[PDB]
C-alpha cells in the first residue's frame, strides 16, 4: 500500500512503558506538626528570612561535597559546579532554590524532613509566644519549616549519590508524602520548589529577591545566581 507522505499522527511513535512511582505518607512528629501550624497561620512582619534558611541549608550540603571528598576522592571528578540557583516562574507562582550539594536520600528525606523531633522546637514555640522574632528559627534547629511563612506547599526533589531520585511534598496539615521520582532527573543536588501564598508573590520580584539576598545571605561562600525570565 504505496505512501509518499504520512501525517504526524500516523508516525507518531508509541509511548515508553508507564513507570510505577511508589509513595508513601508520615505523619510530622508532633510538635513538628504544632510548629508547623504556628508558621502558617500567625502574622509575622519578617517573613522573608525563608530564604536565608533555606540557601544555609543548601550551603550547607555544598560544604558537605568538599568534606565528603576526604573519604571518598571520586567526587573530586565530578564537573558539576558547586553553586545556588534561584528561579521565579510567575506563570506558575513558584520559588524554586536548586543546589548541587549532596542531595537527600529517600531515608534522609523521612527522617530529617519531618519524622524525627529537634530538642529545640518546643523551646522555639514558646519563645515565639513569649514575642520572639522569627528570625531566630535558624538557632532553634528547624529552619526548614520556614518555608511555610510564604509557601503553601513545598516540593523538594533531591538526588544523592547513594540512591535514586525522591520527591518529598507537604501541603502542611500534619503529614507529608515521599514518591520516587522518575521524571527529569536533576542530577545530584536538591531542588526546594515553593508554591507561593497569594499575598506572597513579592518573592517572585528580581528586586525582591535580590534585596533579600544581600541583606542576610552575604556569607554562602558559593556562587548564587538569580534566573531571570525575559518579559515578554
Ligand atoms: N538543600 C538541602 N540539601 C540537603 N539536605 C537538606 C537541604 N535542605 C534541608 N536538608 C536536610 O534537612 C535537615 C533539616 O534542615 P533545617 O530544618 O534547616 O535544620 P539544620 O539546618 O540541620 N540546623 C538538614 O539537616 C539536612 O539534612
Ligand atoms: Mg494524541
Ligand atoms: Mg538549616
Redesign the pocket.
Same mark, same amino acid.
Given at each position: 500500500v504505496p505512501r509518499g507522505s504520512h501525517m504526524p499522527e500516523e508516525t507518531q511513535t508509541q509511548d515508553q512503558p508507564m513507570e510505577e512511582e511508589e509513595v508513601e505518607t508520615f505523619a510530622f512528629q508532633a510538635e513538628i506538626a504544632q510548629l508547623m501550624s504556628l508558621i502558617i497561620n500567625t502574622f509575622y512582619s519578617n517573613k522573608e528570612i525563608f530564604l536565608r534558611?533555606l540557601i544555609?541549608?543548601?550551603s550547607?550540603?555544598l560544604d558537605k561535597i568538599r568534606y565528603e571528598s576526604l573519604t571518598d576522592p571520586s567526587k573530586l571528578d565530578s564537573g558539576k559546579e558547586l553553586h545556588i540557583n534561584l528561579i521565579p516562574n510567575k506563570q506558575d507562582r513558584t520559588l524554586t532554590i536548586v543546589?548541587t !550539594?549532596? !542531595?537527600?536520600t529517600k531515608a534522609?528525606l523521612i527522617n530529617?524532613?519531618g519524622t524525627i523531633a529537634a530538642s529545640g522546637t518546643k523551646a522555639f514555640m514558646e519563645a515565639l509566644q513569649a514575642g520572639a522574632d522569627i528570625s531566630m528559627i535558624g538557632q532553634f !534547629?528547624? !529552619?526548614?519549616?520556614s518555608a511555610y511563612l510564604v509557601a503553601e506547599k513545598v516540593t523538594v526533589i533531591?538526588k544523592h549519590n547513594d540512591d535514586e531520585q525522591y520527591a518529598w511534598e507537604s501541603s502542611a496539615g500534619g503529614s507529608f508524602t515521599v514518591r520516587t521520582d522518575t521524571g527529569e532527573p536533576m542530577g545530584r543536588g536538591?531542588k526546594?520548589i515553593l508554591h507561593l501564598k497569594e499575598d506572597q508573590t513579592e518573592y517572585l520580584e528580581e528586586r525582591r529577591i535580590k534585596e533579600i539576598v544581600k541583606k542576610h545571605s552575604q556569607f554562602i561562600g558559593y556562587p548564587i545566581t538569580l534566573f531571570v525570565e525575559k518579559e515578554r
Open positions: 534558611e544555609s541549608n543548601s550547607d550540603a543546589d !550539594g549532596i !542531595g537527600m534522609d530529617n524532613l !534547629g528547624v !529552619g526548614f519549616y533531591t536538591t526546594v
